[PDB]
Amino acid sequence: TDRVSVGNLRIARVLYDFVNNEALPGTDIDPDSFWAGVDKVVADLTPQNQALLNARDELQAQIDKWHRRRVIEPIDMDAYRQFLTEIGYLLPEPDDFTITTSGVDAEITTTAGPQLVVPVLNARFALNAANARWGSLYDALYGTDVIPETDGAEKGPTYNKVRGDKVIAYARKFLDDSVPLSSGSFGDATGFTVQDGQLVVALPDKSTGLANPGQFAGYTGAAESPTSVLLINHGLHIEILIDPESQVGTTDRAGVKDVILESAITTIMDFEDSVAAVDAADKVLGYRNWLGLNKGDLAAALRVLNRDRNYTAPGGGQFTLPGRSLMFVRNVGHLMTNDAIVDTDGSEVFEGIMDALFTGLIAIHGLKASDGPLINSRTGSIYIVKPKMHGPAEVAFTCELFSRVEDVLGLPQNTMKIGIMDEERRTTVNLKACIKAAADRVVFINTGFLDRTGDEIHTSMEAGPMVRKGTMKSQPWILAYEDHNVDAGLAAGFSGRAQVGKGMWTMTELMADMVETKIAQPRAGASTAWVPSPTAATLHALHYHQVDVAAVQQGLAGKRRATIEQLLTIPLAKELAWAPDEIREEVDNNCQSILGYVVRWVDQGVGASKVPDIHDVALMEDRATLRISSQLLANWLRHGVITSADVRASLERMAPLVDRQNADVAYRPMAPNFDDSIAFLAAQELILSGAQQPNGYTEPILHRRRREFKARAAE
């Protein structure tokens, strides 16, 4: 049946065909040697993979029981800390070291700027994401609420000159702030010229050059009347498009048509928490998109990947700039199996092992010429993000897996670099050892704060009721965790060598708020942080022109700003903390978020969705926010904050609101036949079984229920 026997493996035919016919040709890897490598790697590494997962359960069971046996008041932290040390949860911190990762591209070692995450299963989005290296500041300002729609500046079907003028003014001020003139303002410019390799800006009364002429990077067209002027600030490029004949430029005082920002410097093509992929068919769809990205020929009806950009040097020679975002791929973590391959006993193969083999194989195409130039890493690297690891031994195992894949693929050792997510507590409190375990492969650490919050709730599930979800962002543990991550990175030598990353902005319509708030991340020394869209990448790029991250990192060096005691501060709520109506709001809010995400997950296979919340804020939800919401409610049910009747009532009450919030044409209602809705029952199960899920992970239930929905839709 539908499977191909190779050693101990029974490969789903759709995957077998995909690899042989699409992924392997062009790599010089022998098909029989590849599949023999798969069989061998899977056989050799599956035992340690399973033992690691069992170690998680052993540790969690010990912590569960420890909390249940606590008599004394507030927790004795000294006792808690030595208990975590006794059981091997808290491990010794290694001696200071510097990472040795080599052959890494400048977009990662040096350039500070936005990092975009996109669901790899969506080809149109992945294409737009790869092309997001450059984006229009004007469109990002006009399209969003960064420019208020107040005083006659409202959007309409047709262009609004009042609004367009505010856009232009906003951009002119950005130029003044980023690439200052020697005297005067870009707002008063009437033209641009190059004279003796030097940019000259025409004002009404005089001319002027740059306060720092080094920021002039090039131009297009004739030096005497350029079609564009290219600036650089903090390593990020700014392009002023000069076109007096265009509509916008006809009204502009210097003919400027647009300001283009280097935006998404890197992009993470995601197989994990923003996608729903539960079998071989789903996995192949994403592998195929990843292949089209690396081969350079991905296309949708036609939209294609961009080629590099051509410029004239200030001195008159020619040069070129990367036109695409440098691509990472995020593999799944150590937990799940997938029946795309099963062994002779019918056991599913570990999906993380498969992702390393297949995404690594496909990535070879990005290292070589696309039928023009090489698509991705000019320095020879493959960039893999590995999520949800717990502790240094799990990092060491990921590195061993990459070493074995490199052997199968015939690649140099350490070709496969690792972006480490710091999004589980046992990685947080052992982060230095985790970095050291990958000292010759690591290209970033990143605080995956949403997963980290889920793991915070589950780990201390037995300790008592936790604070409400909105309170987590300001809890002591999470502030220490964010600072602890930057300290570890800089102390391991990340400045100039590897990104220090922070987390995702989820409120896709609140771009004014993002431009106001998200500047805190570069200000905290992060050389990158996550945005959900190309538009958001362009606006987040403003922050890197305001903040000199390299300076910030230099000033943070050698500091030790989080103690182990702060990292271990459990977000327990104080008693009597909430009125009944606050409890009710938190329950309704979490049930609505779960139902809104799960219904598109189970019914349509969408893993990241714009879901409005109880205050009608549009949130771009992924699986990690589902882990938080379900674990919180499970924690509140576990300690008697809420009853089973409250949960069921809230779910039933919020489900028709979700039914209505969708209406779209593919959508099917959950109300009123709740016991007939797989998606409703999945939502219920995520809550009522949440405390029994391993580390609170949602994939076991989501996968099972999505597969169930698939099986019913087929018959």
> Would you name the residues annotated as active-site residues?
330, 622
Binding segment (CB under 5 A) for Mg ion, from list 62-70, 172-180, 320-328, 621-629: 621-629
DSSP readout, 149-217?
Answer: S-SS----SS--HHHHHHHHHHHHHHHHHHS-BSSS-GGG--EEEESSS-EEEE-SS-EE-BSSGGGEE
Residue 274 known to bind ligand: yes
Residue 33 known to bind ligand: no
The pair phi, psi for residue 28, each rounded to 5°, is: 60, 15
Binder of ligand C0V out of 444, 449, 494, 636 (CB under 6 A): 449
H helical segments located in 225-279: 247-251
Distance CA 405, CA 418 (A): 13
Distance CA 689, CA 704 (A): 14
Query: Binding marks (x or -) toward ligand C0V, 584..613, rule CB under 6 A?
Result: ------------------------x-----
Helix, strand, coil in percent for the chain, rounding step 5: 50, 20, 35
Give the SS3 label for residue 97.
coil
Residue 477 binding target from Mg ion, ligand C0V, none, CB below 5 to 8 Å by type: none
Binder of Mg ion out of 624, 632, 642, 683 (CB under 5 A): 624
Rank residues 414 and 447 by Cβ distance to ligand C0V and give the closer one: 447
Give me the least distance between CB of 245 and Mg ion, in Å please: 34
CA-angle at 137, arms to 131 and 143, nearest 5°:
95
Tokens of residue 109, six digits = 């070692």
- Close Cβ partners of 30 (under 8 Å, ≥ 6 residues apart): none
Residue 124 known to bind ligand: yes
Rank residues 453 and 677 by Cβ distance to ligand C0V and give the closer one: 453
Query: Binding marks (x or -) toward ligand C0V, 498..537, rule CB under 6 A?
Result: -----xx-x-------------------------x-----
Binder of Mg ion out of 548, 613, 652, 708 (CB under 5 A): 548
Nearest to 137 by CA among 522, 505, 537: 537
Give me the least distance between CB of 450 and Mg ion, in Å please: 6
Residue 448 makes contact with ligand C0V by CB under 6 A = yes
Residue 424: alpha-carbon gap to chain centroid = 15
What one-character DSSP code corresponds to residue 63?
Answer: H
Residue 548 binding target from Mg ion, ligand C0V, none, CB below 5 to 8 Å by type: Mg ion
The pair phi, psi for residue 418, each rounded to 5°, is: -130, 125
26: left (phi over 0), alpha (psi -120 to 50) or beta: left
Give me the least distance between CB of 427 and Mg ion, in Å please: 11
Query: Binding marks (x or -) toward ligand C0V, 251..270, rule CB under 6 A?
Result: -------------------x
Binding segment (CB under 6 A) for ligand C0V, from list 83-91, 390-398, 449-457, 578-586: 449-457
Residue 427 binding target from Mg ion, ligand C0V, none, CB below 5 to 8 Å by type: none
Rank residues 294 and 446 by Cβ distance to ligand C0V and give the closer one: 446
Give the SS3 label for residue 484.
helix
Give me the least distance between CB of 597 and ligand C0V, in Å please: 11
Binding segment (CB under 6 A) for ligand C0V, from list 138-146, 204-212, 616-624, 677-685: 616-624
Rank residues 119 and 218 by Cβ distance to ligand C0V and give the closer one: 119
Query: Binding marks (x or -) toward ligand C0V, 369..408, rule CB under 6 A?
Result: ----------------------------------------
Residue 423 makes contact with Mg ion by CB under 5 A = yes
Asked if residue 165 lies in contact with residue 136, where contact means CB atoms within 8 angstroms, the answer is: no
**Stretch 239-298 residues interacting with Mg ion (CB under 5 A):** none
Residue 630 makes contact with ligand C0V by CB under 6 A = no
Query: Binding marks (x or -) toward ligand C0V, 404..433, rule CB under 6 A?
Result: -------------------x----------
Residue 349 makes contact with ligand C0V by CB under 6 A = no
Number of H helices, E strands in the chain: 25, 26
Give me the least distance between CB of 686 and Mg ion, in Å please: 17
Query: Binding marks (x or -) toward ligand C0V, 211..250, rule CB under 6 A?
Result: ----------------------------------------
Question: 513-520, long-range: CB within 8 Å, 24+ apart, which pairs?
Answer: 514/539, 514/540, 515/146, 515/539, 515/542, 515/543, 518/543, 519/543, 519/546, 519/547
Residue 503 binding target from ligand C0V, Mg ion, none, CB below 5 to 8 Å by type: ligand C0V
Residue 123 makes contact with ligand C0V by CB under 6 A = no
Give me the least distance between CB of 178 and Mg ion, in Å please: 8
Helix H or strand E segment including 445: strand 442-447
Distance CA 706, CA 303 (A): 31
Residue 117 binding target from Mg ion, ligand C0V, none, CB below 5 to 8 Å by type: ligand C0V
The pair phi, psi for residue 129, each rounded to 5°, is: -65, -40
Binding segment (CB under 5 A) for Mg ion, from list 67-75, 163-171, 347-355, 417-425: 417-425
HSE value, Cβ hemisphere, 13 Å, CA-based, for 505: 30
Nearest to 524 by CA among 586, 566, 493, 481: 481
Give me the least distance between CB of 107 and Mg ion, in Å please: 20
- Close Cβ partners of 576 (under 8 Å, ≥ 6 residues apart): none
Asked if residue 442 lies in contact with residue 486, where contact means CB atoms within 8 angstroms, the answer is: no
Residue 641 binding target from Mg ion, ligand C0V, none, CB below 5 to 8 Å by type: none
Angle between helix axes 476-491 and 449-459 (nearest 10 degrees) is 120
Give me the least distance between CB of 306 and ligand C0V, in Å please: 21
Give the SS3 label for residue 612.
strand
H helical segments located in 531-643: 534-546, 549-556, 564-567, 580-604, 623-638
- Close Cβ partners of 663 (under 8 Å, ≥ 6 residues apart): none
Binder of ligand C0V out of 42, 75, 90, 117 (CB under 6 A): 117
Binding residues for ligand C0V, how many (CB under 6 A)? 17
End-to-end CA distance of the chain: 19
Which residue in this structure is represented by tokens 């951009």? 171
**Stretch 438-467 residues interacting with Mg ion (CB under 5 A):** 448, 451
Residues that bind ligand C0V (CB under 6 A): 117, 270, 273-274, 423, 448-451, 503-504, 506, 532, 608, 620, 622, 624
Binding-site members are 117, 124-125, 274, 303, 330, 423, 448-451, 532
Binding-site members for glyoxylate are 330, 423, 448-451
Residues that bind Mg ion (CB under 5 A): 423, 448, 451, 548, 624
Binding-site members for Mg(2+) are 423, 451
Binding-site members for acetyl-CoA are 117, 124-125, 274, 303, 532
